[PDB]
């Protein structure tokens, strides 16, 4: 009802098509005494209308927010499933390849020590799943016992009761060391990465449940439907206006920025540790190759030991493609918590525009990101001394996981 008409027709139709009584709409433009939210002036909105539209806009913002969150959560979840499943498959496939090829290559050497290898793979598996062990001692034990058994089997003629320190003549060659280093780096790398994906996923899932405040509700009502109430339903909110409003509403969520970026940075970094620097494939799916090399070494050092007294890394593999895609997706969503207002405004709510008093230009500067930066926010009045607890706990989770990944990166 501008341009020389006070008829509330369009406000009536819009308010009605939104599932509210058409009877509640005043026939013509009335006095605005009653308005709790919209600036007091001549309006087509009654109390019931204002409240209803407030509820509507609030619910709409909620829907948008949880939709975006749902997208992000879906992405992280699919990433998690993909990487976990692929690491497990690499290990399992290594084991199957060993079981299938070793009897031909080594015969009784392998077949009478199969449980040793199976046990080693089970230990590696437990180690990946997070059970608290480490490979140095486990592999050391493995190689000790394996050397014992293999030496016994090589020499049925001599009965050998017990303490063979002839080792570190390196009967198995360099393979035990290579396996030690590579497995130590790669498996904790993989585990920490997967753990990081899990943590990010849980953080998003939990943050999504943080409710919008009353201040935010009123500011959003003012942002969206106060244009309708003040006689300009065709008017749409100014981008910077919308952005200040949402920055006011989503300050707590925006406080996750620093630690989210830290976590995602360390997660991008840790993927490098999946491989070595020598142009060799990942040990996570090629343990059997090093085992086989160790056994070959032992065989061709059988005489010498007796003393009584790794295929090149493919240009592209599954893991590498997965890592590229993952790094793309993670670099893409590192800005999430502060990009929320911009994207939510750009997509849905937001060239002469509604500044919240009237149609026109919106002067005020866009606020910075984060709770503290909203102390002066003109559109939303936010108390900065009252942070949300859920957000804080999630930030702690991000801190912890990040530390885990930095340590994992170092070792």
**Nearer residue to ligand NAG within complex by CB, 89 or 386:** 89
CB of 95 to ligand NAG, least distance (A): 8
Binding partner at 89 among Ca ion, ligand NAG, none, C-beta below 5 to 8 Å by kind: ligand NAG
**Nearer residue to ligand NAG within complex by CB, 99 or 343:** 99
Determine the Cα–Cα distance for residues 353 and 238; give it in Å rounded to an integer: 5
Binding partner at 392 among ligand NAG, Ca ion, none, C-beta below 5 to 8 Å by kind: none
CB of 131 to ligand NAG, least distance (A): 14
Q: Is 129 in the site for ligand NAG (CB under 6 A)?
A: no
Q: Is 390 in the site for ligand NAG (CB under 6 A)?
A: no
Q: Is 88 in the site for ligand NAG (CB under 6 A)?
A: yes
Long-range contacts of 58-63 (CB under 8 A, 24+ apart): 58/212, 58/216, 58/217, 58/220, 58/221, 60/224, 60/348, 61/212, 61/216, 61/220, 61/249, 61/344, 62/212
Chain residues 293-322 in contact with ligand NAG, contact rule CB under 6 A: none
Determine the Cα–Cα distance for residues 65 and 210; give it in Å rounded to an integer: 11
- How many residues lie near ligand NAG (CB under 6 A)? 4
Which residue is it, tokens 């806009």? Answer: 57
Binding partner at 88 among Ca ion, ligand NAG, none, C-beta below 5 to 8 Å by kind: ligand NAG
- For residue 190, what are its two tokens? 């993989």
Cβ atoms 140, 134 nearer than 8 A: no
Name 43's bridge partners.
30
Binding partner at 272 among ligand NAG, Ca ion, none, C-beta below 5 to 8 Å by kind: none
CB of 137 to ligand NAG, least distance (A): 23
Q: Which of 315, 325, 231 is nearest to 42 (CA)?
A: 231
Long-range contacts of 313-319 (CB under 8 A, 24+ apart): 313/275, 313/279, 313/280, 313/281, 313/282, 314/281, 317/281, 317/282, 318/86, 319/86, 319/90, 319/274, 319/282, 319/284, 319/285
- For residue 349, what are its two tokens? 């709510």
**Nearer residue to Ca ion within complex by CB, 184 or 373:** 373
**Nearer residue to ligand NAG within complex by CB, 89 or 134:** 89
Residue 237, φ and ψ in degrees, nearest 5: -65, 145
Cα 269 to Cα 17, 181, 190, 193, 320, distances in angstroms: 52, 19, 12, 9, 14
**Nearer residue to ligand NAG within complex by CB, 92 or 101:** 92
Determine the Cα–Cα distance for residues 88 and 129; give it in Å rounded to an integer: 9
Query: Which residues precede gaps in the chain, with C-N > 2.5 A?
Result: 162, 309, 350
Binding partner at 381 among Ca ion, ligand NAG, none, C-beta below 5 to 8 Å by kind: Ca ion
Residue selected from 92, 101, 111, 153 as contacting ligand NAG according to rule CB under 6 A:
92
**Nearer residue to ligand NAG within complex by CB, 85 or 332:** 85
**Nearer residue to Ca ion within complex by CB, 116 or 208:** 208
Residue selected from 89, 152, 331, 352 as contacting ligand NAG according to rule CB under 6 A:
89
Q: Which of 61, 356, 350 is nearest to 230 (CA)?
A: 356
**Nearer residue to ligand NAG within complex by CB, 55 or 92:** 92
Give the interface segment with ligand NAG, choosing from 24-32, 55-63, 82-90, 188-196 (CB under 6 A). Answer: 82-90
For 237, how many CA atoms within 13 A lie in the half-sphere containing its CB? 25
Determine the Cα–Cα distance for residues 285 and 282; give it in Å rounded to an integer: 6
Binding partner at 300 among ligand NAG, Ca ion, none, C-beta below 5 to 8 Å by kind: none
**Nearer residue to Ca ion within complex by CB, 123 or 335:** 335
Q: Is 85 in the site for ligand NAG (CB under 6 A)?
A: yes
Binding partner at 82 among Ca ion, ligand NAG, none, C-beta below 5 to 8 Å by kind: none
Give the interface segment with ligand NAG, choosing from 9-17, 25-33, 81-89, 130-138 (CB under 6 A). Answer: 81-89
Residues near ligand NAG (CB under 6 A) are 85, 88-89, 92
């Amino acid at each position: 009802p501008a341009s020389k008409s006070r008829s509330c027709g369009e406000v009536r139709q819009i308010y009605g098509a939104k599932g509210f009584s058409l009877s509640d709409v005043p026939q013509a433009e009335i006095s605005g005494e009653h308005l709790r939210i919209c600036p007091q002036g001549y309006t087509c909105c009654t109390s019931e209308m204002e409240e209803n539209l407030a509820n509507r806009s609030h619910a709409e913002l909620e829907t948008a927010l949880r939709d975006s969150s749902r997208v992000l959560q879906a992405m992280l979840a699919t990433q998690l499933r993909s990487f976990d499943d692929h690491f497990q498959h690499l290990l399992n496939d290594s084991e199957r390849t060993l079981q299938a090829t070793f009897p031909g290559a080594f015969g009784e050497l392998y077949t009478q020590n199969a449980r040793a290898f199976r046990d080693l793979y089970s230990e590696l598996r437990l180690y990946y799943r997070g059970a608290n062990l480490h490979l140095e001692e486990t592999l050391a034990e493995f190689w000790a016992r394996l050397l014992e058994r293999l030496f016994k089997q090589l020499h049925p003629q001599l009965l050998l009761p017990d303490g063979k320190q002839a080792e570190a003549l390196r009967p198995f060659g360099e393979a035990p060391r290579e396996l030690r280093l590579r497995a130590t780096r790669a498996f904790v790398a993989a585990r920490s990465f997967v753990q990081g994906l899990g943590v990010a996923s849980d953080v998003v899932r939990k943050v999504a449940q943080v409710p919008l405040g009353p201040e935010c509700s009123r500011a959003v009502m003012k942002l969206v439907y106060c244009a309708h109430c003040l006689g300009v339903p065709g008017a749409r909110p100014c981008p910077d206006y919308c952005r200040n409003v949402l920055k006011g509403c989503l300050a707590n969520q925006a406080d996750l920025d620093a630690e989210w970026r830290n976590l995602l940075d360390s997660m991008v970094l840790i993927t490098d540790k999946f491989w070595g620097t020598s142009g060799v494939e990942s040990v996570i799916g090629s343990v059997h190759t090093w085992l086989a090399e160790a056994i070959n070494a032992l065989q061709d050092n059988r005489d010498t030991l007796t003393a009584k007294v790794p295929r090149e890394r493919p240009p592209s593999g599954t893991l590498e493609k997965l890592v590229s895609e993952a790094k793309a997706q993670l670099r893409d969503v590192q800005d999430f918590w502060i990009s929320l207002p911009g994207t939510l405004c750009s997509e849905k709510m937001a060239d002469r525009c509604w500044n919240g008093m009237a149609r026109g230009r919106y002067l005020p500067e866009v606020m910075g990101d984060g709770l503290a930066n909203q102390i002066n926010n003109p559109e939303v009045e936010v108390d900065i001394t009252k942070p949300d607890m859920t957000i804080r706990q999630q930030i702690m989770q991000l801190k912890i996981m990040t530390n885990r990944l930095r340590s994992a990166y170092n070792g």
